[PDB]
């Protein structure tokens, strides 16, 4: 049996619904593939990727009216039109004032797909969009205010062609988009867009995941990173595994209303190395260390919101200033130091400072390999960033070693026949 035939929908105790294997799955094996029910490309990736198939290309056929949407050919342009029509005219009319969030952009595509294709889609083999968990009973004022702001934005930019249901039905739908929604990312883990994969959304969370979700354009591919036996539950990671048990569970309680009780969460085995303190002769107080963790956590959240409006020169300054204050107590291997080093590397890449970005990457990779589990995409993308930075700076010996190390992880996660692997092999 293959695809969703060798797997089944079942009730996981204390987790609601879940997916379990009916056949053995080895490391690297493709469990199932799921096409996108609805998908949307991020504004910052326009001109680099096709709006319909997400294929990265140089020189795409741009839209005549708006000149914002880019396509492979007339076929990609015509096929994306039922979804693009909701944005083409408003982009010309509103101009700089056209600013709907990616959540609003995607929810509009779901409402359009629910109209065009009301019957069951190939994306809904085991779980349907109408059957999705919303956590309406658990929703607080903070979330309801954000959902209401999104509903108001949906009415402001998409009410020309889309007939909306009652406010309470939209509250449930937006909550379902947050609970079951995915973000399509490339080989370098750069944000490409947002999508809905109902069959993939059936899998529960674990900090020790047995599977990984990679993308082949708009198609999500689920591959094993651990040995799965028949009857075993299929688990994926909903969050970045670099952070300790506290930081991990605070995000899971805030975004998905649950507390993870897996092996890494129970034992808290990696927490010590993650929040590593320097070996000082005159160390700060236990309360002073707690203050720096609080500062670092607030600096990460402030950078998250500042990223979308502040200039790269300002963003690089917060990365540098935070690192200097944290470096007085925290080690270079510390996860809070690594985040600001990663963000500074990202800023350096936008500013096209290759030597600057390489300096950070060389300090990030060794603690990254230690903190992250085996076959992690964050480690794979870091080797991929280093390799491409070494190759570009004519250090072809160091590049070849890093790109091969990225391939070694990606052959299990993306599969040996993935187009990304073929590109990296051609770069060598
Ligand atoms: O089925 C899944 C999906 O989750 C997975 C699964 C597997 C692997 C990885 C991930 C995740 O990493 C994917 N994350 C995607 C990003 N995403 C969010 O984080 C939304 C949460 N909002 C944060 C707080 C918040 C919670 C609830 C409410 Cl109601 C409100 Cl208002 C706010 C959005 C998606 C839709 C477009 C906007 C972004 N398995
Ligand atoms: C995207 S849905 C996963 C499918 C869901 N279990 C269903 O009913 O179809 C995520 C929700 O599943 C639950 N969940 C996932 N992993 C869990 C875990 N390890 N422990 C407890 N609940 C979990 C939470 O309620 C979370 O909001
Ligand atoms: Zn295309
Ligand atoms: Zn257009
Ligand atoms: Zn856990």
Answer yes or no: are the C-beta atoms of 258 and 205 closer than 8 Å.
Answer: yes
Closest by CA to 214, choosing from 412, 4, 52, 61, is 412
Domains for the chain: give ranges and CATH numbers: 7-44+182-238 (2.170.270.10), 45-180 (no CATH), 240-428 (1.25.40.10)
Ligand 2 atom with the shortest distance to the CA of 131: 9
Residue 10 annotated as binding site: no
Nearest CA to ligand 1 atom 26: 255
Q: Are strands 182-185 and 70-71 parallel, antiparallel or unpaired?
A: unpaired
Beta-sheet strand order (sheet of 191-196) = 38-41, 191-196, 182-185
Atom of ligand 2 nearest to the CA of 257: 27
Q: Report CA(287)–ligand 1 centroid distance (Å).
A: 33
In the sheet where 30-35 sits, what is the strand order? 30-35, 219-224, 211-216
Q: Which ligand is nearest to the CA of 56?
A: 3
Gyration radius of the chain's alpha carbons? 22
Name where the chain breaks: residue before each gap, C-N > 2.5 Å.
Answer: none
Q: How far is CA 188 from CA 72, 214, 291, 406, in A?
A: 22, 12, 33, 10
Contacts for 49 with CB less than 8 Å, ≥ 6 apart: 41, 55, 56, 57, 70, 192
Whole-number Å distance, alpha carbon 73 to ligand 3 midpoint, is 6
What is the C-alpha separation between 129 and 177, in angstroms, rounded?
9
Q: Is 298 left (phi over 0), alpha (psi -120 to 50) or beta?
A: alpha
Question: Is 257 known as a binding-site position?
Answer: yes
Distance CA 340, CA 302 (A): 12
Nearest atom of ligand 1 to the alpha carbon of 202: 1
Tokens of 404: 């091969």
The answer to whether 188 and 403 have CB atoms below 8 angstroms apart is no
| Nearest CA residue ID for atom 11, ligand 1 | 238
Choose one of 197, 256, 265 to mutate for the ligand 2 pocket test, by most ligand atoms within 8 angstroms of C-beta.
256
Atom of ligand 2 nearest to the CA of 202: 4
Alpha carbon 63 to its chain's center = 28
Residues in contact with ligand 1 (CB, 6 Å cut-off): 102-103, 106, 143, 146-147, 175, 177-178, 180-183, 194, 201, 213, 236, 238, 254-255
* H or E element at residue 236: strand 235-236
**Cα 194 to ligand 3 centre (Å):** 17
Nearest CA, atom 24, ligand 1:
255
Q: Collapsing DSSP states into helix, strand and coil, what is residue 14?
A: coil
Q: Is the CB of 16 under 6 A from ligand 2?
A: yes
Neighbours of 147 (CB within 10 A): 21
Please give the backbone phi and psi of residue 133, each rounded to the nearest 5 degrees, phi first.
-80, 135
C-alpha–C-alpha distance, residues 38 and 197, integer Å: 8
Kindly identify the ligand whose nearest atom is closest to the C-alpha of 238.
Answer: 1
**Bridge partners of residue 214, in order along the sequence:** 221
- Those residues with Cβ within 8 angstroms of residue 21's Cβ, 6 or more apart along the chain or in another chain: 6, 7, 31, 228, 229, 230, 231, 232, 234
Contacts of 23 (CB under 8 A, 6+ apart): 1, 6, 230
Query: 323: helix, coil or strand?
Result: helix
Closest residue CA from atom 11 of ligand 2: 256
Of residues 295, 347, 301, 300, the one with CA closest to residue 325? 295
Pick from 16, 134, 182 the residue to mutate for probing ligand 2's pocket: most ligand atoms within 8 Å of its CB: 16
């Amino acid at each position: 049996a293959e695809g969703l035939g060798g797997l089944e929908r079942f009730c996981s105790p204390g987790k609601g619904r879940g997916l379990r294997a009916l056949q053995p799955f080895q490391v690297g094996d493709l469990l199932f593939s799921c096409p996108a029910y609805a998908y949307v490309l991020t504004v910052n990736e326009r001109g680099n990727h096709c709006e319909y198939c997400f294929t990265r290309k140089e020189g795409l056929s741009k839209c005549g009216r708006c000149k914002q949407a880019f396509y492979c050919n007339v076929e990609c342009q015509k096929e994306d039109w039922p979804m693009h029509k909701l944005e083409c005219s408003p982009m010309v009319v509103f101009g700089e004032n056209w600013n709907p969030s990616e959540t609003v952009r995607l929810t509009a595509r779901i409402l359009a797909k629910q109209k065009i294709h009301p019957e069951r889609t190939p994306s809904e083999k085991l779980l349907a969009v109408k059957e999705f968990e919303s956590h309406l009973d658990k929703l607080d004022n903070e979330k309801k205010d954000l959902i209401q702001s999104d509903i108001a934005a949906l009415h402001h930019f998409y009410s020309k062609h889309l007939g909306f249901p009652d406010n309470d039905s939209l509250v449930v739908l937006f909550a379902q988009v947050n609970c079951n929604g995915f973000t399509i990312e490339d080989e370098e883990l750069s944000h490409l867009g947002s999508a809905i994969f109902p069959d993939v959304a059936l899998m529960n969370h674990s900090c020790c995941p047995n599977v990984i979700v990679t993308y082949k354009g708009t198609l999500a591919e689920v591959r094993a990173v651990q040995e799965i036996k028949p009857g075993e539950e299929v688990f994926t990671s909903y969050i970045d595994l670099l952070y300790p048990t506290e930081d991990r569970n605070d995000r899971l309680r805030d975004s998905y209303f649950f507390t993870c009780e897996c092996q890494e969460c129970t034992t808290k085995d990696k927490d010590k190395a993650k929040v590593e303190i320097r070996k000082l002769s005159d160390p700060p107080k236990a309360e002073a260390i707690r203050d720096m963790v609080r500062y670092a956590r607030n600096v990460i959240e402030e950078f998250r919101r500042a990223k979308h409006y502040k200039s790269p020169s300002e963003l690089l300054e917060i990365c540098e200033l935070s690192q200097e204050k944290m470096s007085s107590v925290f080690e270079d291997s510390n996860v809070y130091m690594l985040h600001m080093m990663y963000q500074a590397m990202g800023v350096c890449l936008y500013m096209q400072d290759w030597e600057g970005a390489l300096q950070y990457g060389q300090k990030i990779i060794k603690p990254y390999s230690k903190h992250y589990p085996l076959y992690s995409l964050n480690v794979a993308s870091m080797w991929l960033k280093l390799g491409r930075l070494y190759m570009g700076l004519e250090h072809k010996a160091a590049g070849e070693k890093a790109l091969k190390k990225a391939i070694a992880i990606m052959e299990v996660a993306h599969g040996k026949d993935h187009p990304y692997i073929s590109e990296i092999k051609q770069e060598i």
